[PDB]
Design a protein around this ligand. Structure first.
Ligand SMILES: Nc1c(O)c(S(=O)(=O)O)cc2c1C(=O)c1ccccc1C2=O
Ligand SMILES: O=P(O)(O)OC[C@H]1O[C@](O)(COP(=O)(O)O)[C@@H](O)[C@@H]1O
Ligand SMILES: O=P(O)(O)OC[C@H]1O[C@](O)(COP(=O)(O)O)[C@@H](O)[C@@H]1O
Ligand SMILES: O=P(O)(O)OC[C@H]1O[C@](O)(COP(=O)(O)O)[C@@H](O)[C@@H]1O
Ligand SMILES: O=P(O)(O)OC[C@H]1O[C@](O)(COP(=O)(O)O)[C@@H](O)[C@@H]1O
Ligand SMILES: O=C([O-])C(=O)[O-]
Ligand SMILES: O=C([O-])C(=O)[O-]
Ligand SMILES: O=C([O-])C(=O)[O-]
Ligand SMILES: O=C([O-])C(=O)[O-]
Ligand SMILES: [K+]
Ligand SMILES: [K+]
Ligand SMILES: [K+]
Ligand SMILES: [K+]
Ligand SMILES: [Mg+2]
Ligand SMILES: [Mg+2]
Ligand SMILES: [Mg+2]
Ligand SMILES: [Mg+2]
Lengths: 419, 436, 424, 424
């Protein structure tokens, strides 16, 4: 069978590895988001359309280079390329915009970072990748620099030195997520210890249910070569197997000769690696480690993921205002795709940070009766799922909704047969 | 500790010291045993049903009212003794005692009526007396038949045929009492509604020292199949003449519950003994202690791993509801059911949360006592004009009765299991509700 | 062969879950291994005759309990003499000789710490060479120290099994177990001191903790009560004996069933038959894994050799682990890991041979030959004696694999070697 | 006691975790590796690494196996490289602390079946006494039989490591592994023959099956590729080396990095540093449990002794397992259970000492003393040689516990004894 299902049914991790089959083709949609750095080699609207088709989910703007005018033009080109597919939900795919800060340099929040963060708020960026975060107060400073208008922007703290690793727990507590920034980390600590920091941080983020990005030199040789090395494909596959929500491309897309091919390579590897995840052990460990909760969204999420595994559900369709109900489903790593139907364009872009969440931006007219409005959003998830290949007639889906309008009231799980 | 820290701060350390919760959080079965505490008091309602045999010592309406208050859920009539007239009078007295509490949902308790057949004797199939007794059962509206000496699938087909078209709703619990019944167990279980480990005859038909193997195997297979299993005979034998049981007897009752029995039974202890009420009270007290000592962490993991994948929405909803109940330490799972099936599918995953089954069927309310942890609530109100409002009223009836009866408190979380259209077979929804 | 893997509940033993293990239990799968849970029989008027005692030894009695709550010192000295006479009547065949321990069960403190009658009874025990003391109503660690002080310097080798019979004993269990050699779950008094419906929790907890500590635990009282007057036990009684073995009890006990009843020999035979069936139904896959995981790291070579030997025995389905032991300690450390292989303990100490009956799965062989001048040849002769006794008793056959556990020098405390041997 | 500092090093908090997720969460960059590097490094010897002086530096950096790629050079060129490896190895024969055996491996050019050039190159290997053959493009069992037949009458002791480089080799993996001594995941050709994004699946599958079979597996090609021209590797390259060790590879390899690059010594040093860190991060609790559960029951005493010895080593945190081996087989059976203790293999065979580098965690000690007339004395002399070399090299100190594995009689094939020794 397909999608490494014989290896998925194994009783031990060793037997799971022994049953991995190169002829077992991946069938599920790619769950791990790809962050591509937008620069000189990937700035044109035409090139950006090809990157979106290749699989780019998040566009990264590196404020260590360029200028405010240069990056504003890159942002406008990303938005133009994204909106060129808005004529049909099959082609349409939201793309988040992330601002990566220059950092503190010689040393706390620098004055250039305050100006760049203000630029991000004014240009409506979705995420901030904060460079060289070494303590909780660095995150509070970034949050303060975003002001009252940037309250919805996600802060992903980049761990790049020994202090960031040692104070990881306090940093994760106040951040929306983490980036394992391996370039600086590999210079700040011995190169042979970076894999320990990566695996530890990914594990702790998976336990906390917060997004984690693996970054830097993943496909480095593709800056000049059309095909990556054996170590590079292995690195991408292992970041997904480690539990990374996102994988990143830096020079490979910002300045390289093969930006589109680098995105295609990360897409192909991630799909293969996701099918090779040993869900039997992973779900059992995530379930056991996740604390008991009296929050109905948390309780519904584990019930929905358990139900999805019981029937081999093709998808879990969830309604979300902020992305939170989809994030709580994602933390249990279901094999079923989490189709998140939202009216918030920003939540649709941001939800790419969570593995296995497929955002659908709802732009249909409202129904007068709220229960009918909910039902049409569910049917929209199903129709978009059928169109995109996620669902077929006869499939079972799990539908996650709330008892009243507004964020924070998810409390219902329903088992539905498609058509 | 981090997996229970926030809930410990919210519910309190006292909450996590009761109902063997430290033993429940253990990482191994050995650690679970080491953490069992005699000072950890049971809090949950008793989930294993008690079947009491009704005979000369327990026939009067006054005595039957005491037995219902002591915990009797199923009244057994042994057709190896008495006559049709004698058993009809016992049935009438049981119904009179049951109806004495029929004035409020907080006081009412349905009691099932089970007919235990005389058996085939030296014959190879259904006896003529059994055909007459089975017809008596249908005419008197019995809920369950305990079929004696079932040896093969065709024996249960014969019992079903003798019940006729009017007894289609009666549950057939096959009694396994000999070597052939044990060897052909899988084919018997497949066609039966449940099983009784009838240890009296089994202990004479096979070596006495092998009965515990047959009991544990049959209970395990019934738990795996999601069908009710009864442990029976000599559980509290010495209580026929003594007011207190032996150390082996209390151990036997506790171990039948730990094995996974849905029901425990009293035969001579209630039918002819000197302490019928005390025997029921003793089974009640032991079952509550033993239910709290069940190692749910391994049990639920093994029930999930062994249960095959399912495309039945009732089955899918049931596992999701039980998982949700464990996540929040839900006080109860309220389920709407017509035939009892949605409650049975919740019961097969052995939730710690009480399964409050709201039904309009008086027969389903009596029969669900066969399933561990199912508390039947008979709803008598006429249907609302709008179906969705009628569903909501039934759920609210379960919540209000749950609060009034001590199952639920303000601040508790409850899991509610319903369907999307009327009629049996459409359960597909799980809701998490906060009690206000 | 396929027949080998159908016996002793081996299909149920290979199961991946406890639920599937239960589902695979087969009443037609006959036990093959020797009975490993020891039987303690209380001696009284129904079991004092030398000829009746010989029948009890043949039926499976391993420990004779003297209940000092009844009778005088003269009565107990006669019981001891009759037990020794019946035991020594089989000594002419050293390959089949079965040692039987003598345990003194104290009257207890009554309304009082250590009573003055207990001091006199304990001194009687030392003077008459008893092997074990079952100390009644132990409520705290200082009760055990008082029993040990009353045994004096001459009774240093006597094992003290603390009887837990009340709420205080259960609450202070950890401190009592730490200073005791073992525990008895004394269910008679316990079932009167605490609610009857809670006794099973105290029993399972104490057995679990004793198994974790690697110390012997006895399940006692009313196990086959109805057999005091009836020839066959009730369904609850056979279930109780089977469940005490499944819980992890090293020993099961008979009180009135052997001391005063009409079927003392049959009560011993019934406990023997049930225990053999229940031992084959133990889910060793989970049990060994959990005992291994819970047992702390050790720098003691006997402890390190024992876990290596038990792992080796499971790897080859060894018929037995033959161990040489002076005090019984090397056999106790093998027993704590609950091997399926019988632990054949060869000793020259008649007292250690009697006392090792406290540990599940230990079969003592008392070696009587004087030492060889070459120590290595004396060790080999003892190992050969274990093999020949094992073949004669049905434990071993030619072609079987056995694990042999010995030490690097004479004297107790130096076990450090494990060897894989093919039986010829 | 060992101290709190002992339990903070070598990822011991992560090793004690109850789940794999908790194990990952407990990995600490400040927890320093203490154990010797157990994954062998194979370095390709070519133009950049051929000189005697450069080879001495490569041996000091950690090279265990010298690979000669017969796709390049000539017989004369490779014979000189072999002579330079042997000269560099023998330059450390005057110091027991610095001396290290180095295996010589011949990697064939490759093929319808065995090529004419491969027959001549295999014959060259036999004549020059090579230890290992890395057979290119093995597609089926008959390709291995052809290589084995080509190793003539003198080379049957040469190890055949089958290189899996195409779709057919992956699909017929089980039949190839059955007849081979080991496997090489030859990722260069594999990444061209099958989609590049599927290579990691083939690598993890083959390593898992080799670990299950107890046969050596090598991870090869482009592990530190950028180090051909750069002094430091990329983040993907260090990750790749660490993950090959975490996957279960016995050996890791360097090709262009040492054969033709500008930093051959630095590439070896980098693989050494990463492997040490990754070996401490192995989750032994799950690995040992799964290796134990998956390995079938065995009646072979070497296999039974090995699992008992590995269990004993884990119980006491043994500094080492010292094993006496003539063929290397007793050390290979210890290595298959992945002990954390270093397996110190004492042998009189120079070829077995070189070949055991294929097995993770085996540290060979070549013993050349004249044999003792009393065999038990000769055994004791070799065990003490392992202990004294262990103290000298930093593996052992007085007061440490070691596990010692020997047999009951001389000659290969009789390992059946495990002993626990305290270092004096
Ligand atoms: N180009 C390579 C090369 O890539 C590799 S490998 O791919 O890293 O194995 C090895 C070699 C060579 C050689 O050029 C060479 C020239 C003369 C003698 C020997 C060699 C040689 O071993
Ligand atoms: O994931 P979030 O942010 O909590 O949003 C989920 C919310 O969406 C709903 O399903 C529908 O809400 P709206 O009708 O306001 O869009 C709510 O019932 C639920 O509380
Ligand atoms: O447990 P059963 O027999 O399947 O009954 C469950 C049924 O009860 C309901 O919850 C309500 O049904 P009714 O309104 O007909 O009583 C259905 O939606 C569901 O199909
Ligand atoms: O189990 P114990 O009491 O520690 O006795 C084990 C001892 O028995 C022996 O195997 C044999 O010793 P003896 O020759 O003194 O009987 C010793 O090597 C070992 O120390
Ligand atoms: O690993 P191998 O090749 O089987 O060798 C192990 C052999 O080594 C020994 O320990 C020592 O044997 P030698 O004295 O012949 O070297 C034997 O007892 C054992 O059979
Ligand atoms: O900043 C980064 O992305 C890094 O250092 O890897
Ligand atoms: O028939 C019965 O109930 C029995 O035999 O136990
Ligand atoms: O003393 C005892 O044996 C008891 O109370 O059970
Ligand atoms: O031959 C090799 O080593 C390869 O192809 O990787
Ligand atoms: K930057
Ligand atoms: K009957
Ligand atoms: K007494
Ligand atoms: K080659
Ligand atoms: Mg950086
Ligand atoms: Mg009967
Ligand atoms: Mg007492
Ligand atoms: Mg190749």
């Amino acid at each position: 069978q397909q999608q490494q299902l014989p290896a998925a049914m194994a009783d031990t991790f060793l037997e799971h590895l022994c049953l991995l089959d190169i002829d077992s083709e991946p069938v599920a949609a790619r769950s791990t988001s790809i962050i591509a750095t937008i620069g000189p080699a990937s700035r044109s609207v035409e090139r950006l359309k090809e990157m979106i088709k290749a699989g780019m989910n998040i566009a990264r703007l590196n404020f260590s280079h360029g200028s405010h005018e240069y990056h504003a033009e890159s942002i406008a080109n990303v938005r133009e390329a994204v909106e060129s597919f808005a004529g049909s939900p099959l082609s349409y795919r939201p793309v988040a915009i992330a601002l990566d800060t220059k950092g503190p340099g010689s040393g706390g929040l620098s004055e250039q970072d305050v100006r760049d963060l203000r630029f991000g708020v004014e240009h409506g960026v979705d995420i901030v990748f904060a460079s060289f975060v070494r303590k909780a107060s660095d995150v509070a400073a970034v949050r303060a620099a975003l002001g009252p208008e940037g309250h919805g922007i996600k802060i992903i703290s980049k761990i790049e030195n020994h202090e960031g690793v040692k104070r990881f727990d306090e940093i994760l507590e106040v951040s929306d997520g983490i980036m394992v920034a391996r370039g600086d980390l590999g210079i700040e600590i011995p190169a042979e210890k970076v894999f320990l920091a990566q695996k530890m941080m990914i594990g702790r983020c998976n336990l906390a249910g917060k997004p984690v990005v693996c970054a830097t030199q993943m496909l480095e040789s593709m800056i000049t070569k059309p095909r990556p090395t054996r170590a590079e494909t292995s690195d991408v596959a292992n970041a997904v197997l480690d539990g990374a929500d996102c994988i990143m491309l830096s020079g490979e897309t910002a300045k390289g000769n093969f930006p589109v091919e680098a995105v295609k390579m990360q897409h192909a590897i991630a799909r293969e690696a996701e099918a090779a995840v040993y869900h039997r052990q992973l779900f059992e460990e995530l379930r056991r480690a996740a604390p008991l909760s009296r929050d109905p969204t948390e309780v519904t999420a584990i019930g929905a993921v358990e139900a999805a595994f019981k029937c081999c559900a093709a998808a879990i369709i969830v309604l979300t205002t902020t992305g939170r109900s989809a994030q709580l489903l994602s933390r249990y790593r279901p094999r079923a795709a989490v189709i998140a139907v939202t009216r918030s364009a920003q939540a649709a872009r941001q939800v790419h940070l969570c593995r296995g969440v497929f955002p659908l931006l709802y732009r249909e007219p409202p129904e007068a009766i709220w229960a009918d409005d909910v039902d049409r959003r569910v049917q929209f998830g199903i129709e978009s799922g059928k169109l995109r290949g996620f669902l077929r007639v006869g499939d079972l889906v799990i539908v996650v909704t709330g008892w009243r309008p507004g964020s924070g009231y998810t409390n219902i799980m329903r088992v539905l047969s498609i058509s």
